[PDB]
Amino acid sequence: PKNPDLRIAQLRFLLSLPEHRGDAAVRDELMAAVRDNNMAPYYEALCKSLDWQIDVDLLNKMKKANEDELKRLDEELEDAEKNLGESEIRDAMMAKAEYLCRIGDKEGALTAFRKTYDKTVALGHRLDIVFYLLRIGLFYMDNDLITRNTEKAKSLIEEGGDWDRRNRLKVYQGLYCVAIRDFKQAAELFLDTVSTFTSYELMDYKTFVTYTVYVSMIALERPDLREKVIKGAEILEVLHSLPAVRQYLFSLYECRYSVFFQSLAVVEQEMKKDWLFAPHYRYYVREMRIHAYSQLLESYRSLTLGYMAEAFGVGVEFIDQELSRFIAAGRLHCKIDKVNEIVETNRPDSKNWQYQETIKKGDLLLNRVQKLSRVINM
Amino acid sequence: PPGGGEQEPPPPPAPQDVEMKEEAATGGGSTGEADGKTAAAAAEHSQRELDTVTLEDIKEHVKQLEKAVSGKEPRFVLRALRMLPSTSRRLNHYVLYKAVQGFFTSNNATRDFLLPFLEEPMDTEADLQFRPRTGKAASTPLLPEVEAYLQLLVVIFMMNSKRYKEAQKISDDLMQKISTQNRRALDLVAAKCYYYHARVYEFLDKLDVVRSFLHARLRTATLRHDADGQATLLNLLLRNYLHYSLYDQAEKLVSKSVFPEQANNNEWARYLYYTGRIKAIQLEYSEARRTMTNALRKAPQHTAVGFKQTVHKLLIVVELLLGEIPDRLQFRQPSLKRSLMPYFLLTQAVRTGNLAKFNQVLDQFGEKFQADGTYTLIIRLRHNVIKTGVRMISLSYSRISLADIAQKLQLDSPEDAEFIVAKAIRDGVIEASINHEKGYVQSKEMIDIYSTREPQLAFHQRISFCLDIHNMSVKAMRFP
Amino acid sequence: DKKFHGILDQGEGVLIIFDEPPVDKTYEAALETIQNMSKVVDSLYNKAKKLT
Amino acid sequence: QNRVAEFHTELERLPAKDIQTNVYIKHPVSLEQYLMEGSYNKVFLAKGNIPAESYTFFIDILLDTIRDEIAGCIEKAYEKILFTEATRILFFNTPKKMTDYAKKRGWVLGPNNYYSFASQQQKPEDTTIPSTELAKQVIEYARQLEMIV
Amino acid sequence: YLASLIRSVVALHNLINNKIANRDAEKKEG
Amino acid sequence: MSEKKQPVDEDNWDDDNVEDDFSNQLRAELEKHGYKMETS
Structure with missing residues (x-):
């Protein structure tokens, strides 16, 4: 079907780019591909994985027989029985369309989708078709499919039916995680976590908890992080199951930095086995290290980095080279020092922060009225 | 001819009407502000100048046969507009010849007879008071004269027809432009001529003779007063000396004309x-x-x-x-x-x-x-x-x-x-x-x-x- | 946790206690008018683009 | 003669002779490149290699206007050194050049110790100095609000 | 930033409101 | 408006902010960043 279907797109990625990760993924994918009569979309995978094997002709006559069994079903149906809409012609012809996502490629499935969308009036059945486009566009990460049908979902459909949209509240920001919006939108609408039935519309629950807790500690640090993920109750049930994730949380909040990096290196290595993975590990770790440095350099204005030699980890020169890259990066607002070996900080004040903002917003509007005064008057 | 010759009637049809009414509205409205409200900076002078950069260069390059731009030269070959009967009779000539060129084929110049079809526009009782009309409607056929891009023996016709215009340009300067001040148009006229006159003196010997002219041209500008005149001629004068890979920059360091x-x-x-x-x-x-x-x-x-x-x-x-x-x-x-x-x-x-x-x-x-x-x-x-x-x-x-x-x-x-x-x-x-x-x-x-x-x-x-x-x-x- | 107004040192092992000015209310509301002034100029240029 | 802004704008009229050939022109532009980054000593070690005529009447002036600049750096608050630092930094172990910079500059040899005093000024300040001109500026504020209607 | 900006922007409204009322009364005179 | 000076003119979707700061410094972040501890 399409309900556990996104595990396949994980094993497409996990087998492909790490060739060293190629032992057990091929063992339970090819047997899963000869299951469910999966015939069209694996020829690309059959080029990148092992060479060839003859069960193609055996499943081609199986995929043609099930095609012809439903072909003679709905041609006799459309030629004898003449009630339409969401009728028997509808669910037989979507069973062709469900067949071409389950077995076929996208092309026969999408033209059956755009045909059957133009026939119906019940917007729940319309939104279920848009649920099917959004999932096959999430398989092949087609960025042009998803910009269309999300606008179909918001504008063209959801002025009516209700509490079916919370399935898409998990999807609109699941697409924001595969983009670079790992910062605020994904953490904002993963915050409603009460949808637990591991469905097709709720693809998994325990990994969804790990996803909403990784993205959460970048949106907000001290701006009451603790109410929504620490004082939050139903989030705290399932991270009481997972021991490493709760250890990864409370190392950051209760300020134990040495055990925090041991957790963080496990997270980055566990991050590697993801399929929306492109914008993660490289950008995630570098943001979380400067995240922990900002609160540690806070509450101090004169820190010696020999105090960071053992209350932090080890490696005197390692802190020295990483602060030097971060201060030169335009971030991590302090000043590192040699001999004296005392990391000195500096911050703006009331006057200094309010003048730095008004010097920029003033010049932007001043340049804006340079052009506006010259568009008029010739 | 059954394929493309049957798609020859649609080309002329439109552009004989709405592209013709462009300079008809431009030449009428520029005359209307040259007469009354003599501060005529705020008109379609600017938008036509934005059009003559953009529109009429790509509206037509060739003279657009079956008499759309091909007709423009026998249309404007007979322009007196001298006295009130000589205006009203040429207004009849604005009626008759546009009807003939809209119907039949008039005198088609074969790309080399364009300069004798720039003689009787300058001749045939042409006026000095309609100095925007002479200045605009002579420079606007120079862009089909240059953007034909064949660049063989029309390059000297480029050289002649610009100095035809520039002799009218200098004489208008030494002609006391009463209350019109064509310099607002003649600046980019002096640009558009000298963009390709710089090309011509790249296809032939050097353009320091342009700079000796443009020094005297910058002299008569802003000694009168500046109305975009010092601004345009300075970037024109600076560009050749920057284009020459000789020393040329301490000349610009001592160039104390830094106020447009x-x-x-x-x-x-x-x-x-x-x-x-x-x-x-x-x-x-x-x-x-x-x-x-x-x-x-x-x-x-x-x-x-x-x-x-x-x-x-x-x-x-x-x-x-x-x-x-x-x-x-x-x-x-x-x-x-x-x-x-x-x-x-x-x-x-x-x-x-x-x-x-x-x-x-x-x-x-x-x-x-x-x-x-x-x-x-x-x-x-x-x-x-x-x-x-x-x-x-x-x-x-x-x-x-x-x-x-x-x-x-x-x-x-x-x-x-x-x-x-x-x-x-x-x-x-x-x-x-x-x-x-x-x-x-x-x-x-x-x-x-x-x-x-x-x-x-x-x-x-x-x-x-x-x-x-x-x-x-x-x-x-x-x-x- | 903002339960306190202070700072620490490691070079001297020293706790230091200070105060802060609450008089930011002028400069806070100063640049919030620029957000109102940003929206009107965006509206005017839209009106001026609509007709010359 | 320190026409370094006139130096690089002079190099525009040379199309490709700087790279292909022409060691007569390649030597001073390799010289100016040695003056670029930090490399004083490669200038003075290429002193014994001129492929052209002697060039001595220019490079005596060229190095003299180098020596006084480093002397101009050491005539700052850098207080005291010995002759061996004037041997390392300036050059030349035991030549009447130590007599040259004893009479031109200061640098009196004490008990095997030179002396260079503090060239730092006092910086007189009041910082309410613009009280007249700031009172001027606010006048033409209201003068340009009123009076021009 | 308050008194120089807003005084300029209000008088800029009086330009567009006049330049509209200039030519839209001019094009309807004929 | 031709100005006579124009005759020539997550894939990498927000890449250059990441790349101008860190380029290629063993981005697995474990073999030295997590493995200092054999020194102590």
Whole structure:
């Protein structure tokens, strides 16, 4: 079907780019591909994985027989029985369309989708078709499919039916995680976590908890992080199951930095086995290290980095080279020092922060009225 | 002829009507403001000038057979408009010949009889009071005369027909333009002629004869008074001397004519491009990169035009001559793909301490540097190859020993690293100081009186600029 | 956790106690008018683009 | 003669002779490149190699206007050194050049110790100095609000 | 930043309101 | 408006902010960043 279907797109990625990760993924994918009569979309995978094997002709006559069994079903149906809409012609012809996502490629499935969308009036059945486009566009990460049908979902459909949209509240920001919006939108609408039935519309629950807790500690640090993920109750049930994730949380909040990096290196290595993975590990770790440095350099204005030699980890020169890259990066607002070996900080004040903002917003509007005064008057 | 000859009637049909009513409304409305309300800057003078750059160059290049632009030369071959009967009879000639050319085929000039069809427009009782009509409707057929692009024996017809116009242009100047002041049109007329007259003197010998004319042309401009005249002729005079690869820049350093004072958002943006290149070649990098920044952010209103990619081209070099670099290829184009790869990979090698890659990609992409006219980077950016790190270190560290900066700049010598730090503070790269007693190089002090003493020295300009907006608003308010 | 107004040192092992000015209410409301002034100029240029 | 801004704008009229050939022109532009980064000593070690005529009447002036600049750096607050630092930094072990900079500059040899005093000024400040001109600026504020109607 | 900006922007409204009322009364005179 | 000076002109979707700061410094972040501890 399409309900556990996104595990396949994980094993497409996990087998492909790490060739060293190629032992057990091929063992339970090819047997899963000869299951469910999966015939069209694996020829690309059959080029990148092992060479060839003859069960193609055996499943081609199986995929043609099930095609012809439903072909003679709905041609006799459309030629004898003449009630339409969401009728028997509808669910037989979507069973062709469900067949071409389950077995076929996208092309026969999408033209059956755009045909059957133009026939119906019940917007729940319309939104279920848009649920099917959004999932096959999430398989092949087609960025042009998803910009269309999300606008179909918001504008063209959801002025009516209700509490079916919370399935898409998990999807609109699941697409924001595969983009670079790992910062605020994904953490904002993963915050409603009460949808637990591991469905097709709720693809998994325990990994969804790990996803909403990784993205959460970048949106907000001290701006009451603790109410929504620490004082939050139903989030705290399932991270009481997972021991490493709760250890990864409370190392950051209760300020134990040495055990925090041991957790963080496990997270980055566990991050590697993801399929929306492109914008993660490289950008995630570098943001979380400067995240922990900002609160540690806070509450101090004169820190010696020999105090960071053992209350932090080890490696005197390692802190020295990483602060030097971060201060030169335009971030991590302090000043590192040699001999004296005392990391000195500096911050703006009331006057200094309010003048730095008004010097920029003033010049932007001043340049804006340079052009506006010259568009008029010739 | 059954395929394309049957698609020959649609071409003429329209453009014989709405492209004809363009200059009919332009020539009527320019005459209407030349007569009354003699301050005629606010008309379709500007939009037709934006059209003669954009529209009528690509509305027609050839004279558009079956008599759309082919008819324009026998249409305007008979123009007196002299007295009130000579206007009303030519108004009948505006009725009859446009009916004939809309119906049948009139006198088709075969691309070389265009100049005798520019004689009887100048002849046939043509007027001097209708000096916008003579100036516009002679220069506007010169663009089909130049953008035919055949460039053989029409180049001397280019040379003749411009000096036909420029003899009328100079005589109008020595003709006392009463209350019209065609200079508002004749500036870009003097530009559009001399863009391709510069091309003609690139296809033949040098254009210093243009500059000897343009010096006298800049002399009679602004001695009368400036109405965009000093602005246009100065960028024209500056461009050849910058185009010549001779010495040519201390001529521009002593060019004390630095007040166009208004440029309608278009001359001033490219004027700041030229003088930014000039202040870059005499090694003043700070003032250059900020007026190159001002030129880039002033008039970008195009669609992947290229000179915007050229001011973006020179701006990254002088910032690599002072260390910082932003994201450059975030506005990538089908043509910027050619021109992003050398410069993005150039600053890739500059930020790292690799010089073998820096010399390799000089050898790899030097011929692209030949097309951009920027040979000089190899002799003057190898300075900042060692100076980028010492700018980066002295911004990061606060009180460093010179014994440790030797390995950090991988120089393997503390004794000359004093001198590199001495040269950078001599050049004002970093404001820091050196303790020559036990080897300390400490940075500056804390954030200074910036919260107290400075900000009124930014506030004074913003008062003065915004009330001048209020002043320029109120003065130009009421035309009725 | 903002239960306190202070700072610490490691170079001297020293706790330091200070105060802060609450008089940001002028400069806070100063640049919030620029957000109102940004929206009106965006509206005017839209009106001026609509007709010359 | 320190026309370094006039130096690089002079180099525009040379199309390709700087790279291909022409060691007569290649030697001073390699010289100016040695003055660029930090490399004082490669200038003075290429002193014994001129492929052209002697060039001595220029390079005596060229190095003299180098020596006084480094002397201008050491005539700052850098207080005291010995002759061996004047041997390392300036050059030349035991030549009447130590007599040259004893009479031109200061640098009196004490008990095997030179002396260079503090060239740092006092920086007289009041910082309420613009009280007249700031009172001027606010006048033309209201003068340009009123009076021009 | 308050008194120089807003005084300029209000008088800028009087430009567009006049330049509209100039030519839209001019094009309807004929 | 031709100005006579224009005759030439997550894939990497927000890449250059990441790349201008960190380029290629063993981005697995474990073999030295997590493996200092054999020194102590």
